[PDB]
Structure 1
Amino acid sequence: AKPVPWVEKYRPKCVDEVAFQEEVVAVLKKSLEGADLPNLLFYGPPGTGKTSTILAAARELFGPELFRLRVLELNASDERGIQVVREKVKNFAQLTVSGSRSDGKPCPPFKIVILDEADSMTSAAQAALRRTMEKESKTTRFCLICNYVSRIIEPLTSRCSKFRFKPLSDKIQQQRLLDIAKKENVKISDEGIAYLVKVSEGDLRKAITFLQSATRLTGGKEITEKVITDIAGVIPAEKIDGVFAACQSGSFDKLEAVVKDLIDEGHAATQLVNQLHDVVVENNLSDKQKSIITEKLAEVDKCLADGADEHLQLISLCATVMQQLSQNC
């Protein structure tokens, strides 16, 4: 009787529990009946349910006893070089399809190779998969899972049927979160669940983690908006107004002061970029100033995605918006 975190306790065991990804779920439910399952390429943002969907499909297709004989799951936590593709994957694809389900349910006549996190594979190891996928297609199937489809080569893009996992909408995510909170005997207000589905941004894993952590923090009592704002790392609007007032002042000393105060408070630069972007696109600035400022915001977000320093990028963005705000003064 050990406790388990809610991201794994509420993982979809079957394909009916996967939310909002209606096209790929419908394809896999047709393949459960006996339709010809093609090669799959799942791609999309994190937390949308790419791994859970194919694991639920494999569990529905093969059952418990045939998962070790029909599914080869390789991810980036193990070595996937050119020799792993040439030896291990090809010898798995060349195996016979034997073993039947003992519970009387039908079993498909193919194997499944789940090459999860196919971004990290090299171009040579991806090029070695091509005739393995084409030649052994009678007895095995392939499911490449990635976050960026540009890092997978165009022959493997052509060989697989591409499914893009959209970010979950607020209706489906709110319904799933309310079902999880109902099954866990915890109460969450409407403002709390609205701020939760605003914060999580289509990441259902982040939403389940925030809901579990808010349940553990409050002890099982009512979850308000304040605990969601506390645990979500959302910068208060007073800091954003102070940053914009420092930019409207036109003095770089106050700009350095507010940047150092935001850095010393440990706020993430991505959250600051998101909140500054919302303030910039939702005010009465001119179109040219908004244009330049949003272009600098996109460049700063790209630089932070490449592991640049937070303080220098934030002071460059703040200098740009200070120049734009003091140009019209």
Structure 2
Amino acid sequence: LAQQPWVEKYRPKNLDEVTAQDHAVTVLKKTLKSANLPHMLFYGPPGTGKTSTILALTKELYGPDLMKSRILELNASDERGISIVREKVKNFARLTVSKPSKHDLENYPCPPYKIIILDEADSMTADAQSALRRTMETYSGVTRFCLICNYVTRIIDPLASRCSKFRFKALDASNAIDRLRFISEQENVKCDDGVLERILDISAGDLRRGITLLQSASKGAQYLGDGKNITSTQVEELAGVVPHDILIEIVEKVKSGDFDEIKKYVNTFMKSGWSAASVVNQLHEYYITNDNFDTNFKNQISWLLFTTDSRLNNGTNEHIQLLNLLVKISQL
């Protein structure tokens, strides 16, 4: 059997297989009915189907055979400056347009232009986006650009004005869980109760991350070889998520407020290898959404967590930061 990531294995092939993006699919179908395809700005929460929808539109345009020749897929966060991405775009545009075959012409409405897709375009700097706008202006005759992003507001106005914008709604929990369940049933993945829900919660609704985590869990279960169902602890381990019992013990140690007990527990915890950033994130999730804490406590603890996260992002010692954060929370 061939090996392929399940993210690219289960991408929808045509626009009719997009589940929850009714508005974007309808607008894209209307645009496809028109003889001219403008520049496109696909924006929305991650794992909603932006890349899937643009790939489906590209296939319905060029045919399954000629799609690969007419498409340049790039990631906008590529390092070594904007120069590498812009030069690749220039080389793709200067390259001669492949002649469609008789079968492709008679079966699909092949347009003269080629499509360049940029992923995570919102991560580009302002100068990089201005250079991309210049390149799009120069080669507007033969190349149509599709910019995929999470935040449309991170794209400069001069670049955004040239693009017709498609907003993708966040996938409902039922739709994402049904997609994950269908993928698991197709691949004969055995899962316990609430395992897919735990995967969705860890991925924060991102279906790409959920599918990747499900594939990783299936691989781990195959490695184990006992034939038992995948459990929540396994997927927590694979995603680097601290178990809930340890977080509850941390919360209780904070509540007691003894400095020596907290220091001893943090010393014991740092030996287990759990990531401190995951601990800070889960403490934030627990405390902010908890109804047993008043407004002042949350006001203080949000700043405490923000300071701890900012210091952790600088590449510091996890033990000291975690102990300081826990002590400061316990003094609240």
AA aligned to 2:9 is: K
* 2:24 aligned with 1:24: yes
Q: Say which SS state the counterpart of residue 144 (structure 1) adopts.
A: strand
RMSD: 3.3
AA aligned to 2:268 is: D
* 2:177 aligned with 1:174: yes
* 2:300 aligned with 1:292: yes
What is the TM-score normalised by the length of structure 1? 0.81
Q: Say which SS state the counterpart of residue 115 (structure 1) adopts.
A: strand
Q: Say which SS state the counterpart of residue 127 (structure 1) adopts.
A: helix
Residue 208 of structure 1 deviates from its aligned partner by: 1.6
* 2:70 aligned with 1:63: no
Map Cα deviations across residues 111-145 of structure 1 (whole Å, 9 max, x no partner): 21223343554433422333543465454311123
Q: Say which SS state the counterpart of residue 99 (structure 2) adopts.
A: coil
Contact 1:167–1:201 (8 Å) recurs in 2: no
AA aligned to 1:195 is: R
Residue 167 of structure 1 deviates from its aligned partner by: 4.2
Residue 185 of structure 1 deviates from its aligned partner by: 2.5
In structure 2, what is the Cα distance between the partners aligned to 1:21 and 1:296? 39
In structure 1, what is the Cα distance between the partners aligned to 2:84 and 2:274? 44
Q: Say which SS state the counterpart of residue 222 (structure 1) adopts.
A: coil
- Residue 184 of structure 1 is aligned with which of 179, 184, 187? 187
Structure 2 unaligned segments of length 5 or more: list them. none
- The equivalent residue for 1:327 is none
Q: Say which SS state the counterpart of residue 144 (structure 2) adopts.
A: strand
Q: Say which SS state the counterpart of residue 128 (structure 1) adopts.
A: helix
- The equivalent residue for 1:253 is 260
AA aligned to 1:242 is: E
Aligned ranges 1:1-329 → 2 under 5 Å: 1-34=1-34, 36-75=36-75, 76-77=77-78, 81-82=82-83, 85=86, 89=89, 92-93=92-93, 99-100=99-100, 102-103=103-104, 104-119=107-122, 121-134=124-137, 136-149=139-152, 151-219=154-222, 221-280=228-287, 281-305=289-313, 307-324=315-332
In structure 1, what is the Cα distance between the partners aligned to 2:208 and 2:323? 32
Q: Say which SS state the counterpart of residue 115 (structure 2) adopts.
A: strand
AA aligned to 2:195 is: G
In structure 2, what is the Cα distance between the partners aligned to 1:24 and 1:309? 46
Residue 304 of structure 1 deviates from its aligned partner by: 4.2
In structure 1, what is the Cα distance between the partners aligned to 2:22 and 2:316? 38
Contact 2:233–2:243 (8 Å) recurs in 1: no
Query: Greater shift after overlay, 299-308 or 234-243?
Result: 299-308
The 1:80/1:216 distance shift into structure 2, 3 A limit, reads same
Residue 285 of structure 1 deviates from its aligned partner by: 2.2
The 1:322/1:9 distance shift into structure 2, 3 A limit, reads same
Contact 2:301–2:329 (8 Å) recurs in 1: yes
Contact 1:82–1:128 (8 Å) recurs in 2: no
In structure 1, what is the Cα distance between the partners aligned to 2:251 and 2:8? 42
Contact 1:188–1:223 (8 Å) recurs in 2: yes
Residue 181 of structure 1 deviates from its aligned partner by: 1.5
The 1:312/1:163 distance shift into structure 2, 3 A limit, reads farther
Contact 1:71–1:113 (8 Å) recurs in 2: yes
Contact 1:191–1:225 (8 Å) recurs in 2: yes
In structure 2, what is the Cα distance between the partners aligned to 1:210 and 1:320? 34
Residue 46 of structure 1 deviates from its aligned partner by: 4.2
In structure 1, what is the Cα distance between the partners aligned to 2:275 and 2:252? 20
The 1:128/1:111 distance shift into structure 2, 3 A limit, reads same
AA aligned to 2:67 is: F
In structure 1, what is the Cα distance between the partners aligned to 2:38 and 2:324? 49
Map Cα deviations across residues 149-201 of structure 1 (whole Å, 9 max, x no partner): 45533311222233454543311110101111121223434422222322221
The 1:222/1:144 distance shift into structure 2, 3 A limit, reads same
In structure 1, what is the Cα distance between the partners aligned to 2:38 and 2:309? 37
Map Cα deviations across residues 241-288 of structure 1 (whole Å, 9 max, x no partner): 322232233332322222333332222234323322233231422220
The 1:301/1:157 distance shift into structure 2, 3 A limit, reads farther
In structure 2, what is the Cα distance between the partners aligned to 1:261 and 1:22? 51
Structure 1 vs Structure 2: percent identity of aligned residues?
50
Q: Say which SS state the counterpart of residue 63 (structure 1) adopts.
A: helix
The 1:150/1:306 distance shift into structure 2, 3 A limit, reads farther
